[PDB]
Amino acid sequence: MTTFLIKHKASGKFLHPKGGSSNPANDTNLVLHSDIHERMYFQFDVVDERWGYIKHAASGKIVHPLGGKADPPNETKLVLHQDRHDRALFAMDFFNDNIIHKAGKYIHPKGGSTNPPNETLTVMHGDKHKAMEFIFVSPKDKDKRVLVYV
Template sequence: MGQDASKTSGDHKYVSIPGMIRHWSGGKFIHPMGGSENPDNDTKLVIHEATHPNMRFRFVQFEGPWGYIEHVASGKVVHPQGGSSDPGNGTALVLHEARHAGALFAFDYENHLIQHRSSKYFHPEGGNVSPPNDTELVLHEDVHDGMRWVVVTVDNVETPLYM
C-alpha cells in the first residue's frame, strides 16, 4: 500500500510559503467548509470566492514531488475522506491531523493539476469550469479544464511552489 509517511513526517525536505489555491477557470479559492481557523477532523474542503487567513495552505514535501498540503492555521492536512491511499472517484477531500501515504499529493504546474498519490486529481464536485461557492472538492481520474488549479500568494499573485 505504500510507505507509512507518519513515521517520518519530521524528515520533510521543503516547506513552501503560505498561500492560497485558486481554481484556474472559476477564480475561487479552496477553503475548509465553514472557514474555521481550527476545523474538526474530516471537515470537507470547498471552493469559495472569499479570502481570509483561514484558507491559507502550504506544501510540506515528503518524498520527491510528493508531500502534504497543510492548512496553515490548524496544521491539518488534506486527505481523501477515509484516508485511503487508493480512493474511488468522487471521494471527498477533507482536512485531518494524521499524516500518512493516503495524504500525499503533488503539484503539476505545467498542466495546473493537483494529483493524489493514487493518480486521481482535485476536482470541484461535478467538474464545472465555474463552480458556485461552497462546491465540495473531490478526487477523480478525469482530466479537463474544470479541474485545474493555480497556487497564489496571499496577495493573489501566481507563484511557483518551489521558491
C-alpha cells in the first residue's frame, strides 16, 4: 500500500539493511542485495514538498548520511538511524530515477558498479550515471513502479 522496494535499476538488486533484520540497530549500513522479503520494504514520509524521510518499514528507522552532517562529502556511508532531523531529508526523483539528498549528492553503490555484488555498501556521491539509478516498485509486482509520495 504505502510500502515499496528500492530497486537498483542496472542490476535489479534492492536496498536492504545490512543483515536483513526487522529491527536493525542505529547506524546499520544500507546495502544492496538480491533477496526480497518484508524486512527490505521502505516507505517515504513527506516533510516539505519534494523532501522527506526514506523509512525502513519494519523498524521505522530512516536513511541518514553517517554522522548526520548537512553537507556530507563523497563516499559518506548511508545508514539507518531513528533520529529525525533536516540532514536526513531526501527527494525520490522518479523522473530521472535517482535519490537525491538535500545538499545535492545522490545515493550510489560504493564503487559505482552497474553490477554490485550482494552486501555492497551505499554511499553519497555527487556524480550522476547509470549505476546510481533507482526505481521504486510494488512489493507485489517488482517490475511495476509505484508512487512513493503517499
